[PDB]
Amino acid sequence: RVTVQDAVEKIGNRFDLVLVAARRARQMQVGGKDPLVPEENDKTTVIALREIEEGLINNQI
Amino acid sequence: QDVVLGLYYMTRDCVNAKGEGMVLTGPKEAERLYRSGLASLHARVKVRIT
Amino acid sequence: EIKELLKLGDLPTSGQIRLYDGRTGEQFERPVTVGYMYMLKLNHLVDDKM
Amino acid sequence: KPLVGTGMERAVAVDSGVTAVAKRGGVVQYVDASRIVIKVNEDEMYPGEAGIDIYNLTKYTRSNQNTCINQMPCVSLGEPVERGDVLADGPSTDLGELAL
Amino acid sequence: REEAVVWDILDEVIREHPVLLNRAPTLHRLGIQAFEPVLIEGKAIQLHPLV
Amino acid sequence: SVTEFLKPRLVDIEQVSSTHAKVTLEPLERGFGHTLGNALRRILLSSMPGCAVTEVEIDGVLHEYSTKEGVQEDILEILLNLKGLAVRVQGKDEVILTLNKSGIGPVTAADITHDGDVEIVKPQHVICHLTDENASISMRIKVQRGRGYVPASTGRLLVDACYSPVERIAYNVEAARVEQRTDLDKLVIEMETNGTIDPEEAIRRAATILAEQLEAFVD
Amino acid sequence: TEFLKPRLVDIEQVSSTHAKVTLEPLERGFGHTLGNALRRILLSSMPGCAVTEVEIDGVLHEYSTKEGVQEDILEILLNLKGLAVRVQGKDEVILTLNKSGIGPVTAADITHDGDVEIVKPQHVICHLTDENASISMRIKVQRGRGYVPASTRIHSEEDERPIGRLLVDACYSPVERIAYNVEAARVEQRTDLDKLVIEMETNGTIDPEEAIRRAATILAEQLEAFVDL
């Protein structure tokens, strides 16, 4: 997977999707949390985008 | 340019061809008909479509 | 005069030949030009630029 | 050789000075892809001379653009040659035709 | 030393790290684009035909 | 080395349907992905043996040209739709079956007189729809054993025969690599088949057909 | 089910290098299917025998020259690359060569053996051109298959070869072109039985009566993975 539009359906500003995907990927890489989506050893780059697909992320979290 | 050349060639109609004028149940047997060399690609046909 | 030379060889004067694809041995549709162009390697070869 | 050319190759390859060209007529005395040496005939010799034109060929050497330039013989031992015949190919030539 | 492991590592490093290709001049935004790389034996950059 | 060329293992059966699968091999020597992919293709699509509908006799017709009433789609379509029926014939060259149905509604291959000697491997195949209070139709369907796909070139209605069960087969070759080279081929074979035979076994049948040719040369 | 199986009924060694072979009868399509498969296998995978290193007495690298010889040492390597020989039950062998006195040098000058057989004695290595001139060299041959360029080979050897060896690129595959053709033939009073003809040009080290069976064998064992699934 690569095209992020379905995540942009959820974060309706596209800039906020980069700020949110970075924040969440940092909670994984740096903050030591782990994903609510099943990871496949993807990069956090892709995991965080795959966490928007589960519909369970916004910049409240 | 080459992609469109190929698609032009694939979709022309040539009024004489091998296997021209028969009736088929779908693309898949259209392909079997082409690949086995039984029908020419720009031959006229009728098919069921969906 | 090119045709005349190709006729003196035992060659096809259309200049074109039918070819087959070595991935399957299928024939190509319509002949294609085949012959001896002259080609130069230019001094812009890649490992000198990568 | 290019199979299709214009007949200008017979001139560019000679006048460009890079093929080694027989200064006087004679017969090939020896060849070894480094030297070619010609027993010039007495109809074109100068009277006090030994009468023998060596041509020490340039072998593998950098061009100003780093391509190599090794000259190679086109003659055979005992072969006759006439003034202005190509004795040795240059780079990009054969039998004295240009051949890029 | 380019040891036999390093490629299996490399093909894990790169496994989805976008790389940015741009020609020059680059008149307009479409003139820098990112692609996922896939490894090649040669020395040329294999670009996609439509792009 | 000199006679121990690399051999694949199936990397996956990669199955997406009982009708279609994507059997993939790795590694193959350079260029063998065609030499086997296409070779098995040309076997599979044209020289697999099997059984298919070959001729039809609907009640009282000389040519599917006659659009007999009571049926929604005309006889040209019933004729091709009956080509659509996949069938298994046990031990016989040609077998005739009878079909009839009555009442307003569809007709299905489940309504055939099922001999048990023959299996209609997809009963739920709709044949036509009926269109009057008195609507009923009765027909003889001939099924025959044969090989490949044979066109309509050769009251009976003739039809092309689909003896080969492969609906489609396609293949690709693609880059694969080992620890020191990437000039080797992967092979992907994709095929889709009419339900008479499962594809991961149809290919094992086809590999046998091809192997049997070589049996007179292999040392 | 009515499949006729082939036998390799006939062969014509039209030259010491070129031959025809025929496989007969075949069903529908199998004339094409084998016809191309065997061509593609014969070109890729027939094993053969190539020169692989050369050591010449007084030379130091490919680009040098030898006094009294008509070729740059490089064009000697370009000549030996084309030399082809059989070897009997060996993975490699070393051939010595010696010549002196003016004139050509040809493969007939190699120190012959029972266990090496050369396809064309007249293939020429250089000329000598001076009365006292000489060359002596130790040509090393290896068996193999496909093509292996010396640049990857020395990167595969991983010890450092001595000064004064020359390396040549390896081109083992012994068949230079293969053609196939399909036609109907008299058997069983019936039509559409293909006489496959395969006809071939080679470096001269092998005979079709091996080659087609070896190609069929390679195919037959590669194909095992598809029945063993």
Side-chain angles (χ1 to χ4, degrees):
Chain A
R1 78 94 59 236
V2 50
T3 44
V4 307
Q5 179 64 28
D6 182 59
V8 179
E9 293 305 323
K10 284 177 274 301
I11 309 188
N13 199 53
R14 200 170 198 121
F15 302 140
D16 294 47
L17 176 63
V18 169
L19 293 173
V20 169
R23 180 182 186 171
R24 184 53 173 194
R26 284 168 158 283
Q27 291 181 343
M28 300 188 285
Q29 197 69 2
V30 195
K33 308 188 188 181
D34 83 336
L36 300 181
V37 71
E39 68 187 26
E40 304 301 345
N41 299 293
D42 10 20
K43 293 183 183 270
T44 45
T45 312
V46 175
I47 297 165
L49 295 169
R50 286 185 159 137
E51 281 195 302
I52 320 306
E53 303 174 334
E54 290 279 29
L56 49 58
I57 286 295
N58 65 294
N59 216 17
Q60 173 66 195
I61 289 71
Chain B
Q1 42 159 72
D2 304 51
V3 170
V4 60
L5 172 68
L7 262 66
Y8 172 89
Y9 179 78
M10 173 169 59
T11 58
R12 267 176 157 235
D13 58 329
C14 188
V15 171
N16 180 61
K18 198 179 183 187
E20 179 261 310
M22 68 215 294
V23 191
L24 282 49
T25 203
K28 292 182 181 68
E29 75 166 23
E31 210 285 332
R32 174 161 55 172
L33 278 167
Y34 171 55
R35 191 66 58 179
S36 64
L38 289 178
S40 192
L41 187 62
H42 42 67
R44 177 150 274 119
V45 80
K46 286 172 180 272
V47 312
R48 180 189 287 164
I49 218 75
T50 184
Chain C
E1 294 179 304
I2 296 171
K3 300 305 178 62
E4 189 175 317
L5 189 63
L6 289 172
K7 181 173 60 178
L8 175 63
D10 203 16
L11 290 173
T13 63
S14 307
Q16 306 183 317
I17 318 185
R18 68 173 68 198
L19 295 187
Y20 305 85
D21 184 329
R23 298 177 297 155
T24 71
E26 74 213 8
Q27 202 188 291
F28 290 109
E29 296 193 312
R30 114 196 74 199
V32 304
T33 292
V34 186
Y36 284 64
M37 183 156 281
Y38 201 58
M39 301 202 83
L40 288 49
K41 199 186 190 184
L42 301 195
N43 192 251
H44 291 289
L45 74 184
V46 70
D47 26 44
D48 208 355
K49 297 184 189 302
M50 188 185 79
Chain D
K1 58 185 174 179
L3 289 180
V4 187
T6 75
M8 204 64 170
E9 303 81 2
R10 282 288 188 165
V12 176
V14 180
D15 288 14
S16 202
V18 69
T19 52
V21 175
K23 297 178 291 184
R24 298 182 293 187
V27 174
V28 176
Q29 188 73 358
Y30 167 122
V31 176
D32 73 1
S34 184
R35 309 196 308 143
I36 295 171
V37 50
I38 308 300
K39 203 174 183 179
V40 44
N41 185 264
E42 65 284 346
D43 69 1
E44 202 159 41
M45 192 162 63
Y46 303 148
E49 207 220 287
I52 189 161
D53 287 332
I54 66 167
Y55 298 76
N56 291 342
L57 303 187
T58 187
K59 301 308 299 189
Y60 300 83
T61 307
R62 68 190 291 260
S63 75
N64 292 359
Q65 297 295 333
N66 306 320
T67 70
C68 79
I69 64 160
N70 73 313
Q71 292 174 322
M72 302 196 73
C74 87
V75 293
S76 330
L77 187 147
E79 190 177 340
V81 297
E82 182 57 294
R83 177 169 170 188
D85 281 320
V86 169
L87 296 177
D89 314 331
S92 300
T93 62
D94 208 332
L95 307 192
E97 298 200 295
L98 193 73
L100 296 322
Chain E
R1 297 291 187 282
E2 66 159 45
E3 287 304 334
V5 67
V6 178
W7 312 122
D8 294 355
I9 299 291
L10 184 68
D11 197 23
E12 192 205 310
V13 165
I14 222 186
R15 182 52 188 67
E16 39 232 327
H17 205 110
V19 297
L20 292 150
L21 262 60
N22 73 272
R23 196 171 174 255
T26 169
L27 299 307
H28 64 319
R29 39 181 277 178
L30 301 184
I32 308 192
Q33 290 182 47
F35 301 116
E36 293 201 339
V38 287
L39 299 311
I40 290 292
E41 291 288 1
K43 295 196 195 88
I45 285 155
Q46 296 233 347
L47 199 80
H48 186 281
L50 296 182
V51 186
Chain F
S1 307
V2 292
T3 311
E4 188 45 32
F5 309 83
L6 293 173
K7 293 168 190 68
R9 302 308 323 161
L10 80 97
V11 62
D12 218 313
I13 72 180
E14 209 80 300
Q15 187 163 16
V16 67
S17 179
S18 190
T19 52
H20 54 286
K22 187 169 280 188
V23 186
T24 303
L25 292 305
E26 189 186 296
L28 290 174
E29 260 287 10
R30 181 164 63 134
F32 280 69
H34 299 291
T35 320
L36 307 174
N38 136 274
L40 294 175
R41 190 198 200 168
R42 205 166 183 78
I43 295 295
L44 277 159
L45 100 171
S46 79
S47 303
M48 277 277 282
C51 303
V53 175
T54 182
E55 310 188 89
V56 174
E57 292 84 18
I58 186 66
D59 58 82
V61 167
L62 297 177
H63 44 37
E64 77 305 318
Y65 174 95
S66 52
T67 55
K68 192 177 182 171
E69 253 283 23
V71 70
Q72 184 168 328
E73 55 282 273
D74 288 318
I75 315 302
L76 181 63
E77 175 155 29
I78 298 176
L79 182 61
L80 89 85
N81 200 42
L82 288 173
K83 192 176 67 170
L85 185 58
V87 184
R88 200 190 313 286
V89 183
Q90 291 168 116
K92 293 177 173 174
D93 303 344
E94 64 180 319
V95 181
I96 299 171
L97 292 90
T98 298
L99 196 177
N100 67 77
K101 191 61 170 284
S102 62
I104 293 171
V107 180
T108 51
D111 305 310
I112 290 172
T113 315
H114 299 297
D115 290 3
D117 187 36
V118 182
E119 305 188 320
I120 302 302
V121 305
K122 287 298 298 179
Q124 294 286 4
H125 191 308
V126 64
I127 309 305
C128 64
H129 269 258
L130 299 176
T131 60
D132 283 312
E133 309 97 314
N134 69 340
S136 176
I137 66 180
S138 184
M139 66 191 84
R140 301 183 306 290
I141 299 165
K142 189 185 287 185
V143 188
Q144 168 173 6
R145 178 162 280 280
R147 188 172 61 178
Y149 180 100
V150 185
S153 191
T154 57
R156 64 101 82 93
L157 304 178
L158 287 165
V159 64
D160 334 287
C162 58
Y163 304 118
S164 170
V166 172
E167 296 283 22
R168 180 172 185 257
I169 177 163
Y171 83 98
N172 307 335
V173 319
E174 58 180 56
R177 54 71 57 158
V178 296
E179 297 88 275
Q180 66 188 359
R181 56 192 176 201
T182 317
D183 57 354
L184 302 176
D185 302 11
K186 208 184 300 171
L187 168 58
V188 178
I189 300 168
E190 178 155 33
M191 72 186 82
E192 318 206 3
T193 185
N194 72 0
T196 56
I197 297 293
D198 295 347
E200 206 219 307
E201 215 282 315
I203 192 162
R204 307 179 189 209
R205 190 164 286 90
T208 302
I209 304 169
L210 180 62
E212 198 79 7
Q213 312 314 304
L214 305 169
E215 200 79 354
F217 308 140
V218 68
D219 290 323
Chain G
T1 309
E2 233 278 305
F3 300 93
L4 300 177
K5 319 311 183 301
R7 298 186 82 102
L8 70 123
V9 300
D10 203 16
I11 301 173
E12 179 174 34
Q13 187 76 54
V14 68
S15 80
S16 309
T17 71
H18 191 286
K20 315 191 192 300
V21 49
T22 173
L23 278 58
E24 181 175 13
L26 292 175
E27 300 284 303
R28 186 67 56 82
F30 295 1
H32 288 289
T33 304
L34 302 189
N36 202 72
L38 296 170
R39 185 218 181 231
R40 182 166 182 88
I41 295 289
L42 284 169
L43 285 172
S44 54
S45 310
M46 285 299 299
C49 192
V51 182
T52 295
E53 290 184 19
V54 187
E55 188 157 9
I56 309 182
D57 46 42
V59 311
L60 300 172
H61 52 65
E62 307 188 36
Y63 316 84
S64 195
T65 182
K66 184 78 184 189
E67 288 61 37
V69 333
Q70 179 73 5
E71 273 65 46
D72 301 6
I73 294 302
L74 214 166
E75 192 163 30
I76 285 181
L77 301 183
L78 289 161
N79 273 45
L80 286 173
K81 178 187 178 295
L83 174 69
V85 300
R86 281 188 275 264
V87 303
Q88 299 289 353
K90 293 188 177 182
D91 50 329
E92 61 171 61
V93 59
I94 294 178
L95 291 317
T96 29
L97 189 163
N98 288 79
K99 193 59 165 285
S100 185
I102 291 158
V105 183
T106 64
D109 296 318
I110 297 166
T111 57
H112 294 282
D113 289 295
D115 50 295
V116 187
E117 187 173 64
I118 297 136
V119 304
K120 183 177 180 177
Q122 299 98 280
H123 186 220
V124 67
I125 281 78
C126 76
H127 306 351
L128 297 184
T129 63
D130 199 13
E131 296 181 302
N132 77 296
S134 66
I135 47 185
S136 67
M137 63 177 84
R138 298 184 190 86
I139 303 163
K140 183 182 182 203
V141 168
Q142 301 193 12
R143 289 292 297 286
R145 57 181 196 87
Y147 159 84
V148 190
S151 51
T152 283
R153 203 190 312 121
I154 67 96
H155 202 60
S156 302
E157 286 165 15
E158 304 210 70
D159 57 348
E160 314 309 328
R161 95 300 192 305
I163 307 302
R165 281 199 182 162
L166 315 176
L167 288 133
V168 301
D169 300 298
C171 49
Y172 308 114
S173 176
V175 292
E176 296 291 81
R177 57 176 169 91
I178 308 291
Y180 92 83
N181 187 234
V182 293
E183 59 182 34
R186 284 288 294 174
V187 166
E188 293 169 22
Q189 301 272 21
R190 64 190 293 186
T191 51
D192 202 18
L193 272 55
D194 290 352
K195 183 204 311 171
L196 170 64
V197 194
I198 287 166
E199 58 195 328
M200 57 170 76
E201 184 59 83
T202 77
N203 66 9
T205 59
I206 52 165
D207 181 309
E209 193 164 49
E210 304 98 52
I212 209 67
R213 285 190 293 141
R214 201 172 200 150
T217 295
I218 296 159
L219 211 183
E221 298 309 330
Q222 283 283 352
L223 185 61
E224 182 157 53
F226 295 77
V227 58
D228 184 46
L229 292 177

Coordinates of all heavy atoms in Angstrom, one line a residue, chain F residues 20 32 37 43 56 59 84 127 137 165 171 186-187:
Chain F
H20 N -9.4 -20.0 -9.4 CA -8.2 -19.4 -10.0 C -7.1 -19.3 -8.9 O -7.3 -19.0 -7.8 CB -8.4 -18.1 -10.7 CG -9.2 -17.1 -10.0 ND1 -10.5 -17.2 -9.7 CD2 -8.8 -15.8 -9.6 CE1 -10.9 -16.1 -9.1 NE2 -9.9 -15.2 -9.1
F32 N 14.5 -19.5 -18.3 CA 13.6 -20.6 -18.3 C 12.2 -20.3 -17.9 O 11.3 -21.0 -18.2 CB 14.1 -21.6 -17.3 CG 15.2 -22.5 -17.8 CD1 16.4 -21.9 -18.0 CD2 15.0 -23.8 -18.0 CE1 17.4 -22.7 -18.5 CE2 16.0 -24.5 -18.4 CZ 17.2 -24.0 -18.7
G37 N 7.2 -21.5 -18.6 CA 5.9 -20.9 -18.5 C 5.1 -21.0 -19.7 O 4.0 -21.5 -19.7
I43 N 0.7 -26.1 -23.8 CA 0.0 -27.4 -23.4 C -1.4 -27.1 -22.9 O -2.4 -27.6 -23.3 CB 0.8 -28.2 -22.4 CG1 2.1 -28.6 -23.1 CG2 0.0 -29.3 -22.0 CD1 1.9 -29.5 -24.2
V56 N -26.6 -29.7 -29.8 CA -27.8 -29.5 -29.1 C -29.0 -29.8 -30.0 O -29.0 -29.6 -31.3 CB -27.9 -28.1 -28.6 CG1 -29.3 -27.8 -28.0 CG2 -26.9 -27.9 -27.5
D59 N -36.4 -28.9 -28.7 CA -37.6 -29.4 -29.3 C -38.0 -28.6 -30.6 O -38.3 -27.4 -30.5 CB -38.7 -29.5 -28.3 CG -39.1 -28.2 -27.7 OD1 -39.8 -27.4 -28.3 OD2 -38.7 -27.9 -26.5
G84 N -21.5 -23.0 -22.1 CA -21.0 -22.7 -20.8 C -21.0 -23.7 -19.7 O -20.4 -23.6 -18.7
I127 N -29.8 -21.9 -17.5 CA -29.8 -22.1 -18.9 C -30.7 -21.1 -19.7 O -30.3 -20.7 -20.7 CB -30.4 -23.5 -19.2 CG1 -29.6 -24.5 -18.3 CG2 -30.2 -23.9 -20.6 CD1 -28.2 -24.5 -18.5
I137 N -39.9 -26.4 -21.7 CA -39.0 -26.7 -22.8 C -38.3 -28.1 -22.5 O -38.0 -28.4 -21.4 CB -37.9 -25.6 -23.0 CG1 -37.0 -25.5 -21.8 CG2 -38.6 -24.3 -23.3 CD1 -36.0 -24.5 -21.9
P165 N -10.3 -27.6 -19.9 CA -11.0 -27.0 -18.8 C -10.4 -25.7 -18.4 O -11.0 -25.0 -17.5 CB -10.8 -28.0 -17.7 CG -9.5 -28.6 -18.0 CD -9.4 -28.7 -19.5
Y171 N 1.1 -16.1 -17.8 CA 2.3 -16.2 -17.1 C 3.2 -15.0 -17.2 O 3.2 -14.4 -18.3 CB 3.0 -17.5 -17.5 CG 3.7 -17.2 -18.7 CD1 5.1 -17.0 -18.6 CD2 3.1 -17.0 -19.9 CE1 5.8 -16.7 -19.7 CE2 3.8 -16.8 -21.0 CZ 5.2 -16.6 -20.9 OH 5.9 -16.2 -22.0
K186 N 12.2 -15.4 -11.7 CA 11.0 -16.0 -11.1 C 10.0 -16.3 -12.2 O 10.1 -15.6 -13.2 CB 10.3 -15.0 -10.2 CG 9.5 -15.6 -9.0 CD 8.8 -14.6 -8.2 CE 9.7 -13.6 -7.6 NZ 8.9 -12.4 -7.0
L187 N 9.1 -17.2 -11.9 CA 8.0 -17.4 -12.8 C 6.7 -17.3 -12.1 O 6.5 -18.0 -11.1 CB 8.1 -18.8 -13.4 CG 6.9 -19.2 -14.1 CD1 6.6 -18.2 -15.1 CD2 7.1 -20.5 -14.8

